[PDB]
Coordinates of N, CA and C in Angstrom, one line a residue:
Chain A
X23 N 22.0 160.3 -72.4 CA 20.9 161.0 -73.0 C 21.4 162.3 -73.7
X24 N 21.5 163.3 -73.1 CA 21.6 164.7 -73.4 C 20.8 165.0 -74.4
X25 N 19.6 165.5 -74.1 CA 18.6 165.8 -75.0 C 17.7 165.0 -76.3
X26 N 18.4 163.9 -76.4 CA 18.3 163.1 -77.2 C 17.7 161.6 -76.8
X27 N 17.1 160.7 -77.6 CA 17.0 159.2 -77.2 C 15.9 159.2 -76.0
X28 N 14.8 159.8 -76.5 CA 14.0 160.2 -75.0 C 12.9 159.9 -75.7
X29 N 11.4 160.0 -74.8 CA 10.0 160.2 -75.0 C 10.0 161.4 -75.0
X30 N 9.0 161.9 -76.3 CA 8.7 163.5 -76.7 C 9.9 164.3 -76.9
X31 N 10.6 164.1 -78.4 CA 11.4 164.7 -78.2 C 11.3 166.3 -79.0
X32 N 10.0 166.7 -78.8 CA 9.7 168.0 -79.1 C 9.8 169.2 -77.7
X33 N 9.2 168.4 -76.7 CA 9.7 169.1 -75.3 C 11.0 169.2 -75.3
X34 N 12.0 168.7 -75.2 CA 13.5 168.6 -74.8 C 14.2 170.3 -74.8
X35 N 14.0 170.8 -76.2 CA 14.5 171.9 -75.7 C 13.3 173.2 -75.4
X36 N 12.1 172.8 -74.6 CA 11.4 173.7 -74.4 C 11.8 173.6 -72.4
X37 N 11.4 172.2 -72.1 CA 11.4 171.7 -70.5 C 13.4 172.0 -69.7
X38 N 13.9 171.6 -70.8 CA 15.1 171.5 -70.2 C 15.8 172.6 -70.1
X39 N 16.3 173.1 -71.2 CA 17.3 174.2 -71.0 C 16.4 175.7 -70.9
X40 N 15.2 175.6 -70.7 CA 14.7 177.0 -71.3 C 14.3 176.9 -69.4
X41 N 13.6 176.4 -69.1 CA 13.8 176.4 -67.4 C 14.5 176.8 -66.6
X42 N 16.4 176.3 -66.9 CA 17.1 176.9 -66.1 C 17.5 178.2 -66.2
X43 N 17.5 178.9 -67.6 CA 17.1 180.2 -67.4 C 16.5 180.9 -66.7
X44 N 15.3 180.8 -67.2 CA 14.4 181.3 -65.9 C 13.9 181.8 -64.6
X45 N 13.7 179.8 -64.2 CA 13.6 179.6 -62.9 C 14.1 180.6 -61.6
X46 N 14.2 181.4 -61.4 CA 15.2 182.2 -60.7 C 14.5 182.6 -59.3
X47 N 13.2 182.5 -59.8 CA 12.8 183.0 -58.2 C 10.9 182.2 -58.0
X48 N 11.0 181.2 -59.2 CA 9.4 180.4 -59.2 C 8.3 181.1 -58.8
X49 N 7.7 182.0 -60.5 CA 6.9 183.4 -60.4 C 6.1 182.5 -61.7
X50 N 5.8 181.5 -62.2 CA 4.6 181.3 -62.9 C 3.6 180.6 -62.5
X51 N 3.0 181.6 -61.5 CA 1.9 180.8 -60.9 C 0.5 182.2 -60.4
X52 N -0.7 181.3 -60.5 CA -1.3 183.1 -60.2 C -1.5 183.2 -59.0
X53 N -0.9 184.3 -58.0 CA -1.5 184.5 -56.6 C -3.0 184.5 -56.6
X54 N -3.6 183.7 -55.2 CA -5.0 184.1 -55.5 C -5.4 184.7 -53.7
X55 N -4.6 184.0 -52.5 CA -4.4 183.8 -51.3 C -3.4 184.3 -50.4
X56 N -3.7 185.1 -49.8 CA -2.8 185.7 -48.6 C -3.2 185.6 -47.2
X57 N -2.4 185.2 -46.4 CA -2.5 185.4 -44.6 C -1.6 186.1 -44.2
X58 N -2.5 187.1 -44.1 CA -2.3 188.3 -43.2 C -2.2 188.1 -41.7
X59 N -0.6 187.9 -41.1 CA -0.7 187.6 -39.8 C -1.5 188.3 -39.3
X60 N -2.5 188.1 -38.5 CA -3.5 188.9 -37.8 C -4.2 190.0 -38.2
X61 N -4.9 190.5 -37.7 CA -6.2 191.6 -38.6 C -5.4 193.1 -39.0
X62 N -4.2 193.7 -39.0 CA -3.2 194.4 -39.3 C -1.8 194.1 -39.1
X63 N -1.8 193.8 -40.5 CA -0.4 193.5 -40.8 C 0.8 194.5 -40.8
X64 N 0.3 195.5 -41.2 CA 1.8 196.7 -40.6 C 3.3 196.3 -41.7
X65 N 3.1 195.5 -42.5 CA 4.0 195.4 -43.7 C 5.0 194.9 -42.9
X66 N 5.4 194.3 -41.4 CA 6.6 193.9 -40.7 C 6.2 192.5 -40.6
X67 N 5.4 191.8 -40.3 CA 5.2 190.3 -40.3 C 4.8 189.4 -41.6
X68 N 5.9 188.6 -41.8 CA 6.1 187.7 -42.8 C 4.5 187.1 -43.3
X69 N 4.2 187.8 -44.2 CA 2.9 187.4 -45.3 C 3.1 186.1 -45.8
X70 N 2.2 185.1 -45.7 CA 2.5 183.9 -46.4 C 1.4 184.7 -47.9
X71 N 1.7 183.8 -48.8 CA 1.9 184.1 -50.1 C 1.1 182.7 -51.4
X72 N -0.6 182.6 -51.0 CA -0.7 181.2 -51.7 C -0.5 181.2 -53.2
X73 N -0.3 180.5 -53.8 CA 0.0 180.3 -55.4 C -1.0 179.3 -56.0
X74 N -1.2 179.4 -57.5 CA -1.8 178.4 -58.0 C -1.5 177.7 -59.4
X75 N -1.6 176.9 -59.8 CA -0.7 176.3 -61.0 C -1.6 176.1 -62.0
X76 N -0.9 175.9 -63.1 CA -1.5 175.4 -64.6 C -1.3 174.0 -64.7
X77 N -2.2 173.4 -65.1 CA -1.9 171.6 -64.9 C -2.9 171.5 -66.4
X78 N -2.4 170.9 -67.5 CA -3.1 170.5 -68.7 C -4.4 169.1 -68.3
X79 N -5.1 168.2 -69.2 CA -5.9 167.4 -68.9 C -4.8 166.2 -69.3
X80 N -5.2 165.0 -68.8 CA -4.8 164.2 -69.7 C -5.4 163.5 -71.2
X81 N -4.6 163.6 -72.0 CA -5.3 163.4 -73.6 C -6.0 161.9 -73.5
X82 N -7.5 161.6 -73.6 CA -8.3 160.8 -73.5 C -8.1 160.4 -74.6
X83 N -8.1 158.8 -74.7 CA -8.8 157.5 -75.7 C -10.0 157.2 -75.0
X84 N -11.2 157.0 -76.4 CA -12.2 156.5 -75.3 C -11.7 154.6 -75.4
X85 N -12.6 154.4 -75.3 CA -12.2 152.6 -75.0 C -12.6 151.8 -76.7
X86 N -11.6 151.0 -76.9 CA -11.9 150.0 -77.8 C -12.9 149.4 -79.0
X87 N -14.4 149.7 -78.3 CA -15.6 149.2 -78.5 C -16.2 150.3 -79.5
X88 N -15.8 151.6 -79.7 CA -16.0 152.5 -80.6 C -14.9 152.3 -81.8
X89 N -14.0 151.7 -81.7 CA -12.8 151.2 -82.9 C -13.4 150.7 -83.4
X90 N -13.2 149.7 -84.6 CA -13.7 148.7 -85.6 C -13.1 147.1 -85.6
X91 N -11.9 147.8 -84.6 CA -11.3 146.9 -84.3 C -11.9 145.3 -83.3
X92 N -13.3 145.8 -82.9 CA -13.8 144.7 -82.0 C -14.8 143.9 -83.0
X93 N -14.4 143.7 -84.5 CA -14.3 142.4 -85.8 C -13.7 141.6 -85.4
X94 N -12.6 142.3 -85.0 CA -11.6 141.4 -85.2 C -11.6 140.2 -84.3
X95 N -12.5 140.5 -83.1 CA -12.3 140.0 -81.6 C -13.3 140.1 -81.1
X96 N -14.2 138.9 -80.6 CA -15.7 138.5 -80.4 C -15.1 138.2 -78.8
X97 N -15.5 139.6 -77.9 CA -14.8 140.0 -76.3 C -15.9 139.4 -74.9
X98 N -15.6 138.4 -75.0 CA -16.3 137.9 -73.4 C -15.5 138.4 -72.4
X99 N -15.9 139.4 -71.3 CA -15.3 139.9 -70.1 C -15.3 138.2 -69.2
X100 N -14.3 138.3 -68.8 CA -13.5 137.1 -68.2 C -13.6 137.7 -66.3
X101 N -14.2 137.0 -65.5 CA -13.7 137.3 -64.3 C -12.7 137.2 -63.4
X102 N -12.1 135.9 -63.7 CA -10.6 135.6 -62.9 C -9.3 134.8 -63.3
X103 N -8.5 135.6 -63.9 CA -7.0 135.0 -64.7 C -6.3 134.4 -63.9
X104 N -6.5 134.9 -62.4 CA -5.7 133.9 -61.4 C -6.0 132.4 -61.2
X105 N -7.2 132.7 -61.8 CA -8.1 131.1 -61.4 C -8.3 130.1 -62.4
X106 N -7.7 130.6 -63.6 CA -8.0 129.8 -64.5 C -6.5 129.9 -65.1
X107 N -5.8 128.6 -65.3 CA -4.3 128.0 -65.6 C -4.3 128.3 -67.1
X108 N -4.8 127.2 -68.0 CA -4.7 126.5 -69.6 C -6.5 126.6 -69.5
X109 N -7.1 127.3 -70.1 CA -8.3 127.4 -71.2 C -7.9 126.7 -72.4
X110 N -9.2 125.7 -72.9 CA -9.1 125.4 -74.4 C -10.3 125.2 -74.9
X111 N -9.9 124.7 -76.6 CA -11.5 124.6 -77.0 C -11.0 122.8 -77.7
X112 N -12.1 122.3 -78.3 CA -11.8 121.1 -78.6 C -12.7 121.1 -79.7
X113 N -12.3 120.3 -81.0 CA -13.1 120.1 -82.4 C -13.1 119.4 -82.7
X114 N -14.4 118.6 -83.2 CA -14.4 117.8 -83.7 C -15.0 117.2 -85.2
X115 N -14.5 117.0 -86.1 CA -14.7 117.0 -87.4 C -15.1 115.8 -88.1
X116 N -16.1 115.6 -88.4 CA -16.5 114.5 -89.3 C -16.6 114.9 -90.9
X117 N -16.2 113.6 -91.6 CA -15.3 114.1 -92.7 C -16.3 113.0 -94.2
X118 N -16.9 113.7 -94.9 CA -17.8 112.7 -95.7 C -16.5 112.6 -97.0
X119 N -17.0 111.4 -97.4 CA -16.0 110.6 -98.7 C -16.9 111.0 -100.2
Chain B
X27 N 26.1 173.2 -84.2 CA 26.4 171.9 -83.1 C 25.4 171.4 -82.4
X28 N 24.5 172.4 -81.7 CA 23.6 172.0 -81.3 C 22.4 170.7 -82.0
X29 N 21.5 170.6 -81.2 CA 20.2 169.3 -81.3 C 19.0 170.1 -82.5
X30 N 18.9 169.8 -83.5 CA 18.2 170.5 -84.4 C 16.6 171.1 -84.1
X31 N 16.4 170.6 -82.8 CA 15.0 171.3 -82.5 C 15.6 172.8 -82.0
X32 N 16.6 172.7 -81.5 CA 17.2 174.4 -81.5 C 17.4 174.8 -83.3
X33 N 17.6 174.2 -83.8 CA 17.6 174.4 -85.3 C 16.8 175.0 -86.1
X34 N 15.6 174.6 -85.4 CA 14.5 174.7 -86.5 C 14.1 176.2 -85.9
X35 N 14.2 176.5 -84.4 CA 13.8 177.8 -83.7 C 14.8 178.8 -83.7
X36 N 15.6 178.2 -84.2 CA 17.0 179.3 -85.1 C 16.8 179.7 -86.2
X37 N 16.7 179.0 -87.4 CA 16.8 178.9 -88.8 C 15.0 180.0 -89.0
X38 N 14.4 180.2 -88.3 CA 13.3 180.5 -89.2 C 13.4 182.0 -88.3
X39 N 14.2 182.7 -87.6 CA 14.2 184.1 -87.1 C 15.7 184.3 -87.4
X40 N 16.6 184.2 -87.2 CA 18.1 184.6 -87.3 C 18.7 185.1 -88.6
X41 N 19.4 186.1 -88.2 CA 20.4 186.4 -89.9 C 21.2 185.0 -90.1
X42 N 21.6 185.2 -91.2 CA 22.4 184.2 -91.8 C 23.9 184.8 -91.1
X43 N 25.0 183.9 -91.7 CA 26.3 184.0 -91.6 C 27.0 185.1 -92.5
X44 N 26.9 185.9 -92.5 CA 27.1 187.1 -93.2 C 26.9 187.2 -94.4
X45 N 25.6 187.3 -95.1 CA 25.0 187.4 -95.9 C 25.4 187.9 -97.5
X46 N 25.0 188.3 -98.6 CA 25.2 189.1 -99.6 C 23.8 190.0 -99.9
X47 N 23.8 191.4 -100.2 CA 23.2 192.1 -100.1 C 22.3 192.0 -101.7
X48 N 21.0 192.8 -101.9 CA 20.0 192.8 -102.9 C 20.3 194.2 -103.5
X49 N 20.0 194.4 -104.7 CA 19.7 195.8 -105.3 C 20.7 196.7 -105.7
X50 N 21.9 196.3 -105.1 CA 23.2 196.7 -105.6 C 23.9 196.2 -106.4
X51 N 24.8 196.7 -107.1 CA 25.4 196.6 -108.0 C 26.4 195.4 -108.2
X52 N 27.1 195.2 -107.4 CA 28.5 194.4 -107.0 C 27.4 193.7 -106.1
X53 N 27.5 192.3 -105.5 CA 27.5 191.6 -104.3 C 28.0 191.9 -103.0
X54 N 27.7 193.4 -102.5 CA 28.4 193.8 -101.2 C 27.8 193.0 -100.0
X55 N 28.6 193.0 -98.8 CA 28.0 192.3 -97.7 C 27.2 193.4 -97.1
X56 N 26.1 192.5 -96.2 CA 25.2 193.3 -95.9 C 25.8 193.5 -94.9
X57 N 25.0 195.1 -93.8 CA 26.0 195.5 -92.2 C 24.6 196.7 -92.1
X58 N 23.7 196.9 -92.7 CA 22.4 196.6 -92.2 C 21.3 195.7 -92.3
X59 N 21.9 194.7 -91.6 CA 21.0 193.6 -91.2 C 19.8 193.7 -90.6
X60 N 19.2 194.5 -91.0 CA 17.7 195.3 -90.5 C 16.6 194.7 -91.6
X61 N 16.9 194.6 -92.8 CA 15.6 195.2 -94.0 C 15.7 193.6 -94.9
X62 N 17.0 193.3 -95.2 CA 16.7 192.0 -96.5 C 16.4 191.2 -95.9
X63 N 15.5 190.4 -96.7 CA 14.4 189.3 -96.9 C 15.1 188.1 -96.9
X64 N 16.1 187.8 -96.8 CA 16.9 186.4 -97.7 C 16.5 185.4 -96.4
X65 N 16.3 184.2 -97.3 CA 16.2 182.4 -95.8 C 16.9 181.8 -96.9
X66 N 18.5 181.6 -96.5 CA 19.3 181.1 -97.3 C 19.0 179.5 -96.8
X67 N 19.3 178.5 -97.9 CA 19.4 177.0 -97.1 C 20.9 177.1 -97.2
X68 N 21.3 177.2 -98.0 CA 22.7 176.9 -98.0 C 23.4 176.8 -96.7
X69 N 23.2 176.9 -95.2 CA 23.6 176.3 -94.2 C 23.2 175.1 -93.7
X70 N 21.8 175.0 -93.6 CA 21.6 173.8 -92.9 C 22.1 172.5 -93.5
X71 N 22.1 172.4 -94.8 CA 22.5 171.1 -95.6 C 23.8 170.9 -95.8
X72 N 24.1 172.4 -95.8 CA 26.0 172.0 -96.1 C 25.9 172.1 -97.6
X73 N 25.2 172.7 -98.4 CA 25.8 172.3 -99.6 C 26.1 173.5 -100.8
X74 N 26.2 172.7 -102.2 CA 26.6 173.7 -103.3 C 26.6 172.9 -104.5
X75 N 25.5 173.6 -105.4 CA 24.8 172.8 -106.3 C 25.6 173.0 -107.6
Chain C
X24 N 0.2 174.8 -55.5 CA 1.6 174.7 -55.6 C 2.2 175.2 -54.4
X25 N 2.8 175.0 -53.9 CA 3.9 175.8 -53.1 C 3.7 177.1 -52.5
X26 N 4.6 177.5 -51.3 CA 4.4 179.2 -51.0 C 5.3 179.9 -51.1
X27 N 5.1 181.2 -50.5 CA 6.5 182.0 -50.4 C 6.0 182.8 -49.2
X28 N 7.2 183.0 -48.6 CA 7.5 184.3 -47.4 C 7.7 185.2 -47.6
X29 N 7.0 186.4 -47.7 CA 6.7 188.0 -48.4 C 7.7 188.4 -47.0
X30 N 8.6 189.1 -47.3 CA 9.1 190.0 -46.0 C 9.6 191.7 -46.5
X31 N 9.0 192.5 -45.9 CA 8.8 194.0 -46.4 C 9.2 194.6 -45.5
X32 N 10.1 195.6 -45.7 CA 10.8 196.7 -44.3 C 9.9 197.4 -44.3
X33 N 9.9 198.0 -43.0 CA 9.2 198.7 -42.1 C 10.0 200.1 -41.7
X34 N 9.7 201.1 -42.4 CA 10.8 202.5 -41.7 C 9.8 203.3 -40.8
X35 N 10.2 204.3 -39.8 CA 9.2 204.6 -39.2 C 9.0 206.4 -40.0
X36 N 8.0 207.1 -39.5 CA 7.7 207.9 -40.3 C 8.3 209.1 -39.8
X37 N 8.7 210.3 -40.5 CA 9.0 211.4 -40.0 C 8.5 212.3 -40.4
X38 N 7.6 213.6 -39.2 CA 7.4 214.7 -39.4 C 8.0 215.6 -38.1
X39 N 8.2 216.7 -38.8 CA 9.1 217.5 -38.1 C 8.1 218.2 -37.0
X40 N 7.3 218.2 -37.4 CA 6.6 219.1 -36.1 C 6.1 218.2 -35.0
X41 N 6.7 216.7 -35.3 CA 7.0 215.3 -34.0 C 8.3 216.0 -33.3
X42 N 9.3 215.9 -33.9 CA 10.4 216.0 -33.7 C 10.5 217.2 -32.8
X43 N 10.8 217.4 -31.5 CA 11.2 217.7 -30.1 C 12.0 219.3 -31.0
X44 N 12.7 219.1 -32.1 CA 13.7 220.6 -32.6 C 12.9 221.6 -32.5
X45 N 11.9 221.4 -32.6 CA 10.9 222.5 -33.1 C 10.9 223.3 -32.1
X46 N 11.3 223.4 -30.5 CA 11.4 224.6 -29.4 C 12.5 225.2 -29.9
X47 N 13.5 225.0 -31.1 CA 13.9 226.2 -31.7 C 13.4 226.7 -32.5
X48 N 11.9 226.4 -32.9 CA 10.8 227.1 -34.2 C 10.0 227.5 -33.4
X49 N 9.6 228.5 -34.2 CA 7.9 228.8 -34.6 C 7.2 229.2 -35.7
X50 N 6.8 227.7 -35.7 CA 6.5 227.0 -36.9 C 5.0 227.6 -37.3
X51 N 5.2 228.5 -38.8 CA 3.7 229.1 -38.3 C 3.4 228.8 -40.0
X52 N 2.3 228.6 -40.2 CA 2.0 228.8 -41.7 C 1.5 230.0 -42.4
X53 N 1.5 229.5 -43.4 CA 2.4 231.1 -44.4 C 2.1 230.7 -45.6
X54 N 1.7 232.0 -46.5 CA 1.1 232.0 -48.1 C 2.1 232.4 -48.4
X55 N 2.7 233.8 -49.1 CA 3.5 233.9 -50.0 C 4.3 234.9 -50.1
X56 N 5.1 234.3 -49.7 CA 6.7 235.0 -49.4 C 6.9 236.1 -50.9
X57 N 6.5 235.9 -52.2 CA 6.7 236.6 -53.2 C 6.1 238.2 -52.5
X58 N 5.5 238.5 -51.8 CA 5.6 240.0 -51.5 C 6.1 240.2 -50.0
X59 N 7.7 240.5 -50.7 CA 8.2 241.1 -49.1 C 9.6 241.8 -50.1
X60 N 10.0 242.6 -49.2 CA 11.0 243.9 -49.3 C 12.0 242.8 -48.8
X61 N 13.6 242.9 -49.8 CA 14.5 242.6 -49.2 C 14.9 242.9 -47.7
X62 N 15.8 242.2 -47.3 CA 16.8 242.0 -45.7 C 15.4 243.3 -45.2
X63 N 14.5 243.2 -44.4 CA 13.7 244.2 -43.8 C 12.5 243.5 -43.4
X64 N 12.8 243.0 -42.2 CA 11.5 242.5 -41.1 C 11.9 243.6 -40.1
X65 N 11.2 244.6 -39.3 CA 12.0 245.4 -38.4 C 10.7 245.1 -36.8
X66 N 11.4 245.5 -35.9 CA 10.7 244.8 -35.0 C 11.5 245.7 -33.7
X67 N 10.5 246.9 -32.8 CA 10.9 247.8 -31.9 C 11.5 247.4 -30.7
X68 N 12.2 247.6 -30.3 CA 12.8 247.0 -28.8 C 12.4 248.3 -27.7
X69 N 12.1 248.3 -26.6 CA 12.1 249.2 -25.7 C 12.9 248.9 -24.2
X70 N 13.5 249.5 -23.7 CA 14.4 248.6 -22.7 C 14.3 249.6 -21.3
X71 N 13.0 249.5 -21.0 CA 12.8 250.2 -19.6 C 13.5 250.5 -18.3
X72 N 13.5 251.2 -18.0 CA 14.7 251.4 -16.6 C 14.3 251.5 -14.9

């Protein structure tokens, strides 16, 4: 690899090298939660410390049936692929002279 | 050397390779790299027309 | 995400009029020393016999 020959290769040098700079002590998160050992803490017993993250959506497609593409393909919902081997259709043509 | 998406986040803030200066007389090198305006291509492509 | 372990020193506090030295004081409060006559606090002794 090295940077290269990947999916998204617009992240590569945002995720990879610009992180290990950083990272040094994992501070991009917003505190929102603290436990206060017991009802006075006195600054001597170890504070736990909650954190919370940024998490994007994932970028939605809606489904197919709003494309134009379902011309192309006249879609019978099928119930069971396991159960059915070889489907066919059969034609028969009569042919005037 | 690097992967040109460092390239592209280079080339549009950084001084050039030791530039030539505007408004003066002779072509002096610049050494206040503070004020001129110049986005030379003449690096990224390698060339000379 | 994840936590962290906050750990913060603890020094204890100091005032001098805790501090046990003070039966070499007498610690008195006081406005302003700007009106006094040099080396001259004088104070009578009598030594009865």
């Amino acid at each position: 690899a090295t940077l290269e020959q990947r999916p998204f290769p617009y992240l590569a040098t945002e995720a990879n090298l610009l992180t290990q700079i950083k990272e040094s002590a994992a501070d991009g998160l917003f505190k929102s939660f603290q436990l206060l050992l017991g009802k006075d803490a006195r600054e001597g017993s170890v504070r736990f410390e909650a954190l919370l993250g940024v998490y994007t959506n994932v970028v939605e497609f809606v489904k197919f049936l709003e494309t134009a593409l379902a011309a192309a393909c006249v879609n019978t919902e099928f119930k069971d692929l396991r159960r059915m081997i070889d489907g066919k259709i059969q034609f028969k043509i009569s042919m005037p002279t | 050397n690097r992967g040109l998406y460092t390239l592209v986040n280079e080339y549009s803030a950084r001084l050039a390779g030791a530039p030539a200066t505007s408004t003066t007389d002779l072509q002096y090198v610049v050494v206040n790299g503070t004020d001129v305006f110049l986005d030379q291509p003449c690096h990224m492509l390698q060339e000379a027309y």
